[PDB]
Design a protein around this nucleic acid. Structure first.
Ligand SMILES: [Mg+2]
Ligand SMILES: [Mg+2]
Lengths: 127, 83, 99, 151, 100, 112
RNA sequence: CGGUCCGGCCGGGAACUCAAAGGAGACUGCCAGUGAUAAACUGGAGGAAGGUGGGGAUGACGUCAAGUCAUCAUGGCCCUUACGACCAGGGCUACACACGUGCUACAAUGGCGCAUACAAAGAGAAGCGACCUCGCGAGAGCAAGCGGACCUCAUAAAGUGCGUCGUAGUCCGGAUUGGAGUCUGCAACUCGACUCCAUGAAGUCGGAAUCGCUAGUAAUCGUGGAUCAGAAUGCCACGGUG
């Protein structure tokens, strides 16, 4: 059973262990609602199983560990996708046809010397 | 500040001079060069000429200065107005 | 029960130093645990290269420190002597623990 | 950019109901990265407006936006320091964006107990062409159409 | 790199490395409340007429090669201007320009 | 009600109402209520009326409006008469805690 | 998979996240249009990433008698019983003023408090310094472990669910003031910082002007690092939201 994935996004990292049965999503021990506050996030982590129809026909079990709701919220999706693919692979299409298969590389640049926040520059004293 | 149990910082020599003044009963000013020294209650009733580099400024120490530094009574800058 | 911590700055020489002790152990004994690379420590420093006044000329340098573990759990009568009779190469540092 | 001419970026599909218009409204109403409370406020206001108008939430939002939808942008393409502005027609995407920005700006302009209540009260006026959005549209259109000899 | 200032600094070490035990025990005694007021006062009065410039926290950390009184680094014991030419020549086992 | 010689507003919370006394801030106001048995979420109204006089007696456990005013005045006058650095910087309109009276003596010198 | 004190404690293991070493890997490689049957540009397909995939060092001959003989060396002048040299006390921190820059606030997306959540990277032996007894608070005493994927600094916040206040110089704003101790170094009147009780300033989006940013960037929130007995709104980095 256990089809697995490893979603990543920002400085986060997931670990989805899909299997066959009934919702029962459970993240880092807590259940979805308990774990994710920003209800928004509680939808990114259910989006993939919506483009298919396994929202209520499969199980799950994740354990994300890095970052913040910021992107931990997302790493789940990536993974839930990589592993969904290993359930049938015919889904690759729809899932790519929705952006859920790419890992966003958007990172966070470095404070460069002289600047003050990566890009922002000390105000210039006019003349 | 300093620890409560460490004690004050009166000088070796200053204590000797004030003891000499207090059992000799002299009204002449006692000049001192220390500026970070504390005050002892036994100097009440004496004139102390404290040195700050410019002049030996006199202090007629009251019974209202024991727990602070004697140097607070003698500033070093010279300024009483821009104009 | 006995282990050696190797500390260096060069992965092209610390690996040779590790090989020269792991092969020695596997020759005059057995039961090795291989080289375990610990997270290397990198210390960064920003240095002004302005002699008198230029608050823009900065250089960002970093000093590396690579750590590896070589633990031989079961020693023979010859392992300790073989790993201590070595003509250790310069630059690397050894912290040996024989508990 | 003089040579680099880019297209238009894509936004999230707003999984609350699903609408690019709603996603854009949310991401322009939010400030200081407070998208969570911005979404709560806008969704509460829209759900109240749904019952207050009798229609669906998305349809009532779309028609309210259309009823205050502008047509002309008054830009400053003057040749120098001399004041010489120019009105021009607006593309549909920037038109919708400007209309919803005016809506969310009137939301901040008019104060009440909560921003959700302000948004609901201002949408209840944009429904029958009242409030601040339609007034601003009229005030921009009068000065954009009164200057026709200047091309 | 003034010669006059290059001798006071070494004196502040050659004298501070000698009074270590007496100062340590005096600090411990006057820091532990389980002491006597007269003994603590006598100890602090004896400590204060010890040479002033022999105190540990009375010398500024001076650069090793050039003695620049600013920008002294613990890691190299050298100022920025000299550590630049040292790391640039390559005498510091591991100092490479970096890029995170 | 009128506590400590000042008619505290009736339509405000007890903590805020008793904070109006010259000598109490946001902490002593909670402390007095905690030590006397008054909640921190009720107005002056809907409260025991004998508790008003109990609080009027309790606020005498420390300095009060007139007492604090006269204490500050006498302290400043004593500093002026002694003539130390404190008095010199007090009866001139300048900060005394070592603040720079060069570019930021701006509510000691007043508006320019 | 198993016992299990419900804790990965170990029994075990190397699928994974992580740890450091060697690599596959995006090259216009493709299909279509445009373009000169080119180079290229535009779409789409695969793809984790697409046209430089995304950030940093690397600053070409030369310009500014550009800036430092105050890091340093240095050809000449120079002082040779003082411009060399001695330590103590002051002043570099002051002031009717004008200016570069930033922090702090204008209050309903905002402050007051009570569950509650997710980071990276760091520094540590004259050291980092868990507990505990205490203190309204700073920290006092006793003090485990650790050159550290082991212990400390370090219950991070913004977020979140509740309550609460209601538009007011405000429960906003936290400066000045009298006093209190604490860290700290022989000594904080000039001249430290922390603390909490008390007065609770100014200020209520600010003319002409003016500066920064094109994407995980603006903008907000907190943390970390070097200097050093302590004394950061300065400096250098780090991630969260977005
Ligand atoms: Mg492509
Ligand atoms: Mg020091």
């Amino acid at each position: 059973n256990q089809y697995y994935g490893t979603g990543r996004r920002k400085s986060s990292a997931a670990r989805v262990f899909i299997k066959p049965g009934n919702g029962k999503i459970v993240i880092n021990q807590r259940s979805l609602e308990q774990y994710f506050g920003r209800e928004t996030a509680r939808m990114v982590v259910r989006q993939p199983l919506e483009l298919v129809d396994m929202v209520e026909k499969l199980d799950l079990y994740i354990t994300v560990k890095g970052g913040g709701i910021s992107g931990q919220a997302g790493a789940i999706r990536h993974g839930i996708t990589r592993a969904l693919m290993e359930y049938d692979e015919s889904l690759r299409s729809e899932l790519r046809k929705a952006g859920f298969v790419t890992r966003d590389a958007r990172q966070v640049e470095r404070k460069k010397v002289g600047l003050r926040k990566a890009r922002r520059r000390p105000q210039f004293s006019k003349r | 500040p300093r620890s409560l149990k460490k004690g004050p910082f009166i000088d070796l020599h200053l204590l000797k001079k004030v003891e000499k003044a207090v059992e000799s009963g002299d009204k002449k000013p006692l000049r001192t060069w220390s500026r970070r020294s504390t005050i002892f209650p036994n100097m009440i009733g004496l004139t102390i000429a404290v040195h700050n580099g410019r002049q030996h400024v006199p202090v007629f120490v009251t019974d209202e200065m024991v727990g602070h530094k004697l140097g607070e009574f003698a500033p070093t800058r010279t300024y009483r107005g821009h104009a | 029960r006995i282990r050696i911590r190797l500390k260096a700055f060069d992965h092209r020489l610390i690996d040779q130093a590790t090989a020269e002790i792991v092969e020695t152990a596997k020759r005059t004994g057995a039961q090795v645990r291989g080289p375990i690379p610990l997270p290397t420590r990198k210390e960064r420093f920003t240095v002004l290269i302005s002699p008198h006044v230029n608050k823009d000329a900065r250089d960002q340098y970093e000093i590396r420190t690579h750590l590896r573990l070589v633990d031989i759990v079961e020693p023979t009568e010859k392992t300790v002597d073989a790993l201590m009779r070595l003509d250790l190469a310069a630059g690397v540092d050894v912290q040996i623990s024989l508990g | 950019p003089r040579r680099r001419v880019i297209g238009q970026r894509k936004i999230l599909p707003d999984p609350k109901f699903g609408s690019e218009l709603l996603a854009k409204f949310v991401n322009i109403l939010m400030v200081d990265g407070k998208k969570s409370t911005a979404e709560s406020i806008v969704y509460s206001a829209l759900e109240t407006l749904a019952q207050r108008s009798g229609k669906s939430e998305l349809e009532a939002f779309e028609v309210a936006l259309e009823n205050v939808r502008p047509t002309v942008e008054v830009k400053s393409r003057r040749v120098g320091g001399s004041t010489y502005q120019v009105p021009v027609e607006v593309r549909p995407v920037r038109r919708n964006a400007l209309a919803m920005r005016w809506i969310v700006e009137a939301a901040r302009k008019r104060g009440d107990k909560s921003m959700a209540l302000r948004l609901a009260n201002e949408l209840s006026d944009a429904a029958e062409n009242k409030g601040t959005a339609v007034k601003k549209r009229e005030d921009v259109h009068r000065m954009a159409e009164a200057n026709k000899a200047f091309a | 790199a003034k010669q006059s200032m290059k001798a006071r600094e070494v004196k502040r070490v050659a004298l501070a490395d000698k009074y270590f035990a007496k100062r340590a025990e005096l600090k411990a005694i006057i820091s532990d409340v389980n002491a006597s007021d007269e003994d603590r006062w006598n100890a602090v009065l004896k400590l204060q007429t010890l040479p002033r410039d022999s105190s540990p926290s009375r010398q500024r950390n001076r650069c090793r090669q050039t003695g620049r009184p600013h920008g002294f680094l613990r890691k190299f014991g050298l100022s920025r201007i000299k550590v630049r030419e040292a790391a640039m020549r390559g005498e510091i086992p591991g100092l490479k320009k970096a890029s995170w | 009600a009128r506590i400590a010689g000042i008619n505290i507003p009736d339509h405000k919370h007890a903590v805020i109402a008793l904070t109006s006394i010259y000598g109490v801030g946001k902490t002593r106001s909670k402390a007095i209520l905690a030590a006397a048995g008054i909640a921190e979420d009720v107005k002056i109204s809907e409260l025991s009326e004998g508790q008003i006089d109990t609080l009027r007696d309790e606020v005498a456990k420390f300095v009060v409006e007139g007492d604090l005013r006269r204490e500050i005045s006498m302290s400043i006058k004593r500093l002026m008469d002694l003539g130390c650095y404190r008095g010199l910087r007090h009866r001139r309109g300048l900060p005394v805690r070592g603040q720079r009276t060069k570019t930021n003596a701006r509510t000691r010198k007043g508006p320019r």
